[PDB]
Amino acid sequence: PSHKTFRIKQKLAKKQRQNRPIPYWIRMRTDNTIRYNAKRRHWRRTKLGF
Amino acid sequence: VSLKLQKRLASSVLKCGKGKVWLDPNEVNEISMANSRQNIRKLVKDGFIIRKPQKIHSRSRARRAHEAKQ
Amino acid sequence: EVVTREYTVNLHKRLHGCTFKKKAPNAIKEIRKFAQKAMGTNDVRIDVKLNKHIWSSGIRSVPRRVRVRIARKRNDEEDAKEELYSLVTVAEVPQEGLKGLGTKVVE
């Protein structure tokens, strides 16, 4: 809602910083196995439950 | 050359409905370069963007009716 | 080869029995089929005034006859499937009506 608490606004902010594709240079490091962000979230597909 | 950003901001600047905005069909490129409420107001002044007049709903037939019920 | 001719199209017999929500849309299609057979042109362009005429009585009342002129012209546009195109437009008509009008050729 537009009326929210600071604590809920704080957690929603962090969830946004985590919806980003991995940097390209991570894919180049020695002995690397990360392919993609396996935790990306879409607001219409998976709800935060908080 | 979609002019969605311009059909909107014409309704808002002219303070009318989006169905009452006329963007000139022969200069879409000048309209398409204006990307601002300032730039839209300039096109308003130049006659490139007008306000279509309201559709007609006359009460003559109601007035004649009420003037025969007397 | 450029030619401009005047036609009367009997839209009544073409649309006889057509569903109401389709008649004036099907009137456009029969104008287009008419011109293709009229000029041997698989490219027919209908003028906006002719479109206005066909829609004037809404979607289910279409003029029973129409006088149009069809003008065969050149695709001067280098990029085109075919050499020629047609321009079908509305045509002014005498006070005698459609009485006695065959296919006239425009000067």
Partner: protein, 80 residues
């Protein structure tokens, strides 16, 4: 009816986030966490769910302080 018509009426939260454990298990009306038992001083845990125990024992977090006690025990807790 039950089913689709009745599922449309979820609008009110029975649980919200808990300050002590962070899970959406704080029952607002009852005012206690169903997971950790807050505000009870002791933590809610049972031996009939060993799996729930191991999800939240020591070592599943940082051990901000107890990480270094092994190193301090060696060298018998020297103070400079």
């Amino acid at each position: 009816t039950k089913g689709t018509g009745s599922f449309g009426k979820r609008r009110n939260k029975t649980h919200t986030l808990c300050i002590r454990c962070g899970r959406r298990s704080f029952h607002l009306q009852k005012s206690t966490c169903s997971s950790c038992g807050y505000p009870a001083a002791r933590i809610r845990k049972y031996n009939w769910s060993v799996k729930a125990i191991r999800r939240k024992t020591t070592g599943t977090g940082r051990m901000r302080y107890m990480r270094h006690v092994p190193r301090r025990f060696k060298s018998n807790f020297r103070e400079g």
